[PDB]
Scaffold this active site. Structure first.
Site, PDB file in Angstrom:
ATOM      1  N   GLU A  35     -16.036  -0.374  -4.015  1.00 25.39           N
ATOM      2  CA  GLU A  35     -16.182  -0.879  -2.674  1.00 25.39           C
ATOM      3  C   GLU A  35     -17.321  -0.238  -1.978  1.00 25.39           C
ATOM      4  O   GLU A  35     -18.069  -0.889  -1.265  1.00 25.39           O
ATOM      5  CB  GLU A  35     -14.933  -0.635  -1.809  1.00 25.39           C
ATOM      6  CG  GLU A  35     -13.747  -1.602  -2.022  1.00 25.39           C
ATOM      7  CD  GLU A  35     -14.045  -3.119  -1.882  1.00 25.39           C
ATOM      8  OE1 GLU A  35     -15.036  -3.545  -1.275  1.00 25.39           O
ATOM      9  OE2 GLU A  35     -13.251  -3.906  -2.400  1.00 25.39           O
ATOM     10  N   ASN A  46     -20.359  -9.873   7.135  1.00 22.02           N
ATOM     11  CA  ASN A  46     -20.188 -11.064   6.312  1.00 22.02           C
ATOM     12  C   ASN A  46     -20.468 -12.186   7.269  1.00 22.02           C
ATOM     13  O   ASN A  46     -19.637 -12.613   8.080  1.00 22.02           O
ATOM     14  CB  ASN A  46     -18.762 -11.207   5.809  1.00 22.02           C
ATOM     15  CG  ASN A  46     -18.220  -9.994   5.036  1.00 22.02           C
ATOM     16  OD1 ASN A  46     -18.512  -9.743   3.863  1.00 22.02           O
ATOM     17  ND2 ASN A  46     -17.436  -9.140   5.694  1.00 22.02           N
ATOM     18  N   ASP A  49     -18.378 -15.597   7.987  1.00 19.01           N
ATOM     19  CA  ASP A  49     -17.182 -15.658   8.803  1.00 19.01           C
ATOM     20  C   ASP A  49     -17.149 -14.669   9.978  1.00 19.01           C
ATOM     21  O   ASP A  49     -16.121 -14.515  10.616  1.00 19.01           O
ATOM     22  CB  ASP A  49     -16.025 -15.469   7.866  1.00 19.01           C
ATOM     23  CG  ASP A  49     -15.703 -14.005   7.611  1.00 19.01           C
ATOM     24  OD1 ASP A  49     -16.580 -13.227   7.266  1.00 19.01           O
ATOM     25  OD2 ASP A  49     -14.552 -13.638   7.819  1.00 19.01           O
ATOM     26  N   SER A  51     -17.222 -11.328  10.203  1.00 19.98           N
ATOM     27  CA  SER A  51     -16.389 -10.162  10.134  1.00 19.98           C
ATOM     28  C   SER A  51     -17.193  -9.062   9.451  1.00 19.98           C
ATOM     29  O   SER A  51     -18.169  -9.364   8.756  1.00 19.98           O
ATOM     30  CB  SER A  51     -15.119 -10.535   9.355  1.00 19.98           C
ATOM     31  OG  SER A  51     -15.381 -10.732   7.973  1.00 19.98           O
ATOM     32  N   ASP A  53     -16.847  -5.325   6.993  1.00 27.00           N
ATOM     33  CA  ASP A  53     -16.005  -4.431   6.190  1.00 27.00           C
ATOM     34  C   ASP A  53     -16.501  -3.028   6.468  1.00 27.00           C
ATOM     35  O   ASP A  53     -17.710  -2.783   6.488  1.00 27.00           O
ATOM     36  CB  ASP A  53     -16.159  -4.681   4.715  1.00 27.00           C
ATOM     37  CG  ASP A  53     -15.838  -6.129   4.341  1.00 27.00           C
ATOM     38  OD1 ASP A  53     -14.745  -6.620   4.623  1.00 27.00           O
ATOM     39  OD2 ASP A  53     -16.689  -6.769   3.742  1.00 27.00           O
ATOM     40  N   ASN A  60     -11.523  -4.867   6.210  1.00 31.96           N
ATOM     41  CA  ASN A  60     -12.049  -5.981   7.015  1.00 31.96           C
ATOM     42  C   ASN A  60     -11.619  -6.099   8.482  1.00 31.96           C
ATOM     43  O   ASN A  60     -10.412  -6.003   8.782  1.00 31.96           O
ATOM     44  CB  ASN A  60     -11.704  -7.266   6.277  1.00 31.96           C
ATOM     45  CG  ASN A  60     -12.439  -8.460   6.862  1.00 31.96           C
ATOM     46  OD1 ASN A  60     -11.941  -9.133   7.757  1.00 31.96           O
ATOM     47  ND2 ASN A  60     -13.642  -8.788   6.418  1.00 31.96           N
TER      48      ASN A  60
END
Length: 130
Positions: A35, A46, A49, A51, A53, A60
């Protein structure tokens, strides 16, 4: 901060992650590895959408933490997303335990499916005395 491998394994063991909801330390290590490369400062936005991380586990902002700018945020960990950019991972771990209390468990992270399920992940904890 960027953890070294065995430093992080001992830290997760201490924080109660080994065997949490049936998930071995080596699986948690594989997940932080892929990750973020064990980096607490990691963020990925991202654009499709809206959002982002956050942190060592790339948690998220739609579902788990709140950053104020993600549409539809639930904030299930009831945490500011900045709590996940700290050098101290105690909050990141408490929110990762919340993610896997959902039936999907660690499968919630597609990087775990791609890089860790059905693989020998024992290399991630070898030599750490954990």
């Amino acid at each position: 901060k960027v953890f070294e491998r065995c430093e992080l394994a001992r830290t997760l063991k201490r924080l109660g992650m080994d065997g949490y909801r049936g998930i071995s330390l080596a699986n948690w290590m594989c997940l932080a590895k892929w990750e973020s490369g064990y980096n607490t400062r990691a963020t990925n936005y991202n654009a499709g959408d809206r959002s982002t991380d956050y942190g060592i586990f790339q948690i998220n902002s739609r579902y788990w933490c709140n950053d104020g700018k993600t549409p539809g945020a639930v904030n299930a960990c009831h945490l500011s997303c900045s709590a996940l950019l700290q050098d101290n991972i105690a909050d990141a771990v408490a929110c990762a335990k919340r993610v896997v209390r959902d039936p999907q468990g660690i499968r919630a992270w597609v990087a775990w499916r791609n890089h860790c399920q059905n693989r020998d992940v024992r290399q991630y904890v070898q030599g750490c005395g954990v």
